[PDB]
């Protein structure tokens, strides 16, 4: 059948699949209590998107729709959501939330923009800084709406609106930025459904390997770390290719094209995440031109060379 | 043994290659004296990026560097530019400007963000709305810097800075948004060099075909039209495949995958643009699931079926 493959891309040629920024580095994490269950950046090796994952790098943590009402609370502006491609969002579809929805606890700062339609100054526009807190009790993207904190309540209308993210931050002391804690997609006291499954190493001495970005923050010292299991370009490539997976684990080798040598090897699991044989937190030291290349399908008995 | 091919992607699955937003529609333009010489979104069919074109959708109209000084002018804050991947920018490289630089006259609004390094509060961050006018006399990206208009002169430091674009507008009455007028990459009274070449129809009855987006604007009625010659995913695909061009013209067909039928055909020229047989401005009426499919290499005399 069609052979499986990776796109040939250096790290600075990769886009984070959980926030619309480039990858900065590879990082391997010590095993711990976290049950990694991100919903953006999820795609099997045979090309099945999962979670809230869609194809467009610009759709990640973006919202599209219509502002339809306001409330007298912090999260003032009620934004009825559409799908990012403009279609009507169906709250009964088997997804956790609209595709592109942020998959972490925290505040996402960026800008809202509007372009009127209809009878009231059609085609008139505006834009301003805004903030969306995935802690907000009005953050109910699964039900079809989120509420925006904006910076200028008097230059804003009940009109088609888009949110463009720029960075993240802790919200306050009691509500920190937790990249591995999912938001309550349906609001407070409700539980999530249709989730892509948790991810964990399952072989002695293996650790998850992440594509890491340091995304912008808006005050204080948060490093803005967002880790994705596979980068957006891999997801896009697997979707195009739809190559049948010949086993549960694709062996992949990080290679220096200038020398032709392999730097280290890793397990790329059929559900779309990577493990490496290493113990301890470690920012990987690798050359700038390095890239993964697909080697072969291996069985469960395969032991990774230590990295 | 890599054959030439297009990725399989609907319009709403395509990213504009001249502004970080999805494609909204396909548009064919009446033949003007218009010089189309855009510098983002330029790539030959065999995978040669040209102009200011880079691979990441998040890098389009983005800047990265360090703010080093302020001046007592409109464009106050001097931003010394790095390449978007962090490497030092080389003003003698054979490119018109750093890759990603905006390629139009207008104002680009967005947000600047900072993260200190060194001895002064390392790790502290901040972010705010900013504007970069490509009419500015201090818009000299080829030379290594642009100056920023920002919104809060007191919460800004001489620290590593990134610019995230959000939308565009006219700057003022005398300096409108003109997507087909290149900025002076080297400043006033200096001419551009290292440009991707201009494109235009070169066959009777043929017109350019654009992937069009309506990007956000910040006030007034500007429609926010940015047309690109090929979408960013085609560029990323051609770069991966680097299939040699067997002739100067690729015959491509727009197909409805549900019905298997061809909706219309077009010429995909070697330098990375599309013509169709049509007279008049026409936003194309096509089904939402449509996509192009490479059909064959044709020669110079090939006459397109009218569209």
């Amino acid at each position: 059948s069609k052979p499986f493959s990776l796109p040939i891309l250096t790290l600075s040629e990769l886009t984070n699949s959980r926030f619309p920024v480039p990858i900065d580095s590879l990082f391997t994490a010590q095993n711990n209590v976290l049950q990694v269950q991100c919903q953006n950046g999820r795609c099997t090796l045979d090309g099945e998107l999962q979670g809230t994952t869609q194809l467009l790098p610009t759709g990640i943590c973006a919202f599209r729709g219509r502002v339809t009402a306001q409330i007298n609370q912090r999260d003032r502006w009620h934004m009825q959501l559409q799908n990012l491609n403009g279609t009507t969002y169906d709250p009964t579809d088997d997804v956790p939330a609209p595709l592109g929805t942020p998959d972490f606890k925290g505040v996402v700062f960026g800008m809202v923009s509007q372009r009127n339609v209809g009878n009231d100054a059609p085609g008139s526009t505006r834009a301003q800084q805004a903030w969306v807190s995935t802690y907000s009790p009005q953050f109910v993207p699964k039900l079809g709406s989120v509420n925006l904190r904006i910076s200028d309540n008097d230059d804003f209308q009940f009109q088609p609106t888009k949110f463009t993210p720029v960075g993240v931050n802790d919200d306050d002391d009691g509500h920190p930025f937790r990249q591995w804690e999912l938001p309550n997609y349906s609001g407070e006291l409700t539980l999530n459904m249709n989730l892509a499954p948790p991810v964990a190493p399952n072989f002695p001495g293996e650790q998850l390997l992440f594509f890491r970005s340091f995304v912008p923050c808006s005050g204080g010292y948060n490093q803005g770390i967002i880790d994705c299991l596979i980068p957006q370009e891999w997801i896009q490539h697997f979707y195009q290719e739809s190559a049948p997976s010949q086993s549960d684990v694709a062996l992949i080798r990080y290679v220096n094209p200038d020398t032709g040598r392999t730097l280290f090897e890793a397990k790329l699991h059929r559900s779309g995440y990577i493990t490496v044989a290493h113990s301890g937190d470690y920012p990987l030291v690798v050359p700038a031109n390095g890239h993964f290349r697909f080697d072969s399908w291996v069985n469960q008995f395969y032991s990774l060379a230590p990295m | 043994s890599k054959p030439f091919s297009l990725p399989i992607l609907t319009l709403s699955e395509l990213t504009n290659s001249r502004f970080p937003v999805p494609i909204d529609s396909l548009f064919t333009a009446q033949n003007n004296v218009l010089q189309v010489q855009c510098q983002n979104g330029r790539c030959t069919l065999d995978g040669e990026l040209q102009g200011t074109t880079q691979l990441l959708p998040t890098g389009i109209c983005a800047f990265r560097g360090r703010v080093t000084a302020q001046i007592n002018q409109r464009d106050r804050w001097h931003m010394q530019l790095q390449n978007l991947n962090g490497t030092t920018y080389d003003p003698t490289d054979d490119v018109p400007a750093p890759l990603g630089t905006p390629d139009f006259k207008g104002v680009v609004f967005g947000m600047v963000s900072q993260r200190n390094v060194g001895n002064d509060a390392p790790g502290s961050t901040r972010a705010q709305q900013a504007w970069v006018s490509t009419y500015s006399p201090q818009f000299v990206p080829k030379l290594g810097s642009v100056n920023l208009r920002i919104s809060d002169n007191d919460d800004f430091q001489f620290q590593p800075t990134k610019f995230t674009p959000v939308g565009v507008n006219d700057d003022d009455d005398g300096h409108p948004f003109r997507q087909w007028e290149l900025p002076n990459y080297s400043g006033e009274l200096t001419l551009n060099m290292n440009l991707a070449p201009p494109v235009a129809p070169n066959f009777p009855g043929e017109q350019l075909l654009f992937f069009r987006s309506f990007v956000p604007c910040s006030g007034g009625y500007n429609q926010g039209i940015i047309d690109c010659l090929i979408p960013q995913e085609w560029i990323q695909h051609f770069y991966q495949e680097s299939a040699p061009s067997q002739s100067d013209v690729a015959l491509i067909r727009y197909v409805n995958p549900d019905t298997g039928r061809t909706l219309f055909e077009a010429k995909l020229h070697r330098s990375g643009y599309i013509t169709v047989a049509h007279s008049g401005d026409y936003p194309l009426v096509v089904p939402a699931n449509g996509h192009f499919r490479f059909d064959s290499w044709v020669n110079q005399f090939y006459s397109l079926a009218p569209m």
Partner: nanobody
Amino acid sequence: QVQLQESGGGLVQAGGSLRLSCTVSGRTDSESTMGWFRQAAGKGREFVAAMNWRYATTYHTDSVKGRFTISKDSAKNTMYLQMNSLKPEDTAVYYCAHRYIYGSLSDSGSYDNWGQGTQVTVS
């Protein structure tokens, strides 16, 4: 419009404590946000801590989170900054600021009004 004035700074030895005070007056509503900043000689203004005037919800940056505590005496119209385990790096002029926007408490920007500042020198 909101008017602010800091107080309580001075010379102190490394290890001691101070309690800065920031008195507030003027129109202040539900989303009014009050923050502390500091600027050492020749360096950039550093965001330190912020609170929501109404509910006293707080954000502290990680460089001070163990040692400094923002707080509000709601009886009076006075914000505070409890500065413990002071080190010479804490030397700076401390400012307080008001912002009509909620934003996020972690957001260092869009602060409109400012007090004149009090000097804090750690020896």
